[PDB]
Subunit: 102 residues, 3 copies
């Protein structure tokens, strides 16, 4: 019983570490991409005489370039990962340990 | 007894992995689409500032190395790395094991057979 | 019997996390490499347009839209994402031990 709780605990901790790693990775990538968006918009605004180029406005990636896709609405918001199940597993471990009243 | 509690613990872990898979898929796909939009705009810029096309494209050996140099790369501007071949395809996370876990739960419950 | 079935359930979860780790590493590394290529091309553009020399580089730190100052530099390149398999490796070692019982 104790060995099986340990196996569950390993899996649960491995998932936590992966969640942390993915959160760190995505947030690092998101911030880097946002910096590229900002610089690309800054370039566009300073080669203003080249703005014969229109903005796409409503169109997305239907077409599997003729207009700008990136706007000040393109910035990615930080991706905060939901640890709801991991937190419930932590609470379940505390409970599992309590039923031990023998 | 205790068997049912251990199935519940497995179920929590399985569901947590499923949610993380979904979250990572959503994140990657969102990032991919945003990066593809940046590629498109950068290519569109390049095509309209034809007086900047004294700049050559990376002679695939250069390009392969830049994508394989498992570091923060030297890169110091030399030729174009981004082409219409740089677009990222959507990321499809393979819930292979989670789907098999769901099928394993149905089996575990059947193997309670005992009369 | 039920012990062997519970080890199999743990094994499924452990392998599912493994596969996800592999997938995320592949995805992030692919994204990182693509973003690094965009950084390089954007810097290459900046270096070949002397008419944009007026544009300053950002005074880094905190306090971060309105167009002003370069954010991307040769210090912006992302390093490859090393996905540690610490727990998975320990689980693999624990399985070998469980089987010895
Ligand atoms: C991966 O997943 C796990 C699962 O949850 C996640 O969990 C983390 O677990 C670690 C282990 O403890 C947690 O670490 C703690 O973080 C505390 C947060 O403090 C922050 O803010 C501090 C404020 O600054 C002022 O106050 C501090 C004193 O509080 C003072 O020293 C400063 O000078 C300043 O006046 C800041 O200091 C702190 O920075 C760290 O480094 C400095 C450098 O020396 C040190 O002086 C600090 O004390 C601190 O260590 C940080 O930015 C932190 O306070 C805490 O430190 C004390 O308490 C812990 C116990 O709680 C003791 O073990 C430790 O020895 C210290 O006495 C400790 O560092 C972490 O917060 C958990 N995170 C979450 C989300 O729960 C991991 O983080 C995940 N990994 C990821 C995402 O990468
Ligand atoms: C990353 O991206 C995401 C994607 O959008 C982004 O999400 C947005 O987050 C912002 C907040 O940061 C959301 O907007 C805020 O909502 C606050 C909540 O107040 C609400 O209740 C008000 C009460 O009205 C009542 O009566 C009416 C009927 O008469 C009824 O319909 C209402 O439901 C309610 O019962 C309501 O008036 C108010 O309305 C605002 O928001 C709605 C959309 O939710 C919009 O349609 C309205 O036109 C109006 O803007 C709202 O429903 C609100 O207090 C807050 O206000 C800010 O601005 C005012 C000045 O305009 C300041 O005085 C105030 O202090 C706040 O600064 C703001 O509107 C927004 O809706 C989210 N987006 C979506 C799609 O939901 C994240 O934030 C991003 N991350 C960032 C930025 O870090
Ligand atoms: C980094 O990447 C870039 C990206 O491509 C790469 O650029 C290429 O550079 C190579 C040269 O190194 C280019 O190819 C060379 O072009 C030489 C020029 O000769 C031309 O004129 C010939 C005359 O024909 C006339 O009549 C015909 C109609 O009949 C008419 O169309 C012609 O325009 C012209 O009026 C013509 O025959 C010849 O054709 C070759 O090139 C074209 C493409 O330009 C191709 O479509 C043909 O099939 C044919 O290959 C050309 O237009 C040419 O002399 C040279 O030849 C080499 O090979 C022969 C043997 O086949 C050797 O005998 C000779 O000594 C040379 O070694 C070669 O073809 C290539 O076109 C560039 N790419 C592009 C898109 O333009 C850089 O080189 C890369 N950096 C590196 C490799 O370091
Ligand atoms: C991205 O990857 C590069 C590749 O290594 C990381 O660079 C490394 O950063 C460390 C941090 O200082 C350098 O260490 C230094 O070594 C000298 C040598 O004795 C020592 O005197 C210093 O006190 C320090 O220990 C390391 O040399 C350097 N390596 C290279 C090739 O640059 C970089 O930090 C990574 N960036 C990240 C993860 O954000
Ligand atoms: C993956 O994440 C998405 C993002 O919300 C979840 O979306 C929900 O999907 C359920 C399934 O029908 C809907 O009922 C909800 O209304 C959706 N929510 C939103 C905001 O769209 C999705 O369920 C997650 N995958 C899971 C839990 O398996
Ligand atoms: C993957 O993306 C590249 C980039 O353009 C594309 O050429 C290739 O066909 C894509 N693979 C697919 C859609 O299977
Ligand atoms: C990749 O997936 C396989 C499939 O189970 C797994 O055995 C292997 O350890 C994984 N590699 C990782 C997570 O680095
Ligand atoms: C950025 O490029 C310049 C140009 O030579 C170089 O001097 C500088 O050291 C580079 N930044 C690095 C290597 O971090």
């Amino acid at each position: 019983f104790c060995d099986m709780l340990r196996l569950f605990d390993f899996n649960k901790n491995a998932i936590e570490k992966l969640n942390n790693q993915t959160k760190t990775a995505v947030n690092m990538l998101t911030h880097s991409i946002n910096s590229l968006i900002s610089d690309n918009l800054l370039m566009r605004n300073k080669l203003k005489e080249v703005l014969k180029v229109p903005y796409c406005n409503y169109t997305r990636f239907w077409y599997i370039p003729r207009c700008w896709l990136v706007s000040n609405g393109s910035y990615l918001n930080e991706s905060d990962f939901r640890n709801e199940w991991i937190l419930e597993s932590d609470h379940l471990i505390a409970e599992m340990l309590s039923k031990e009243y023998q």
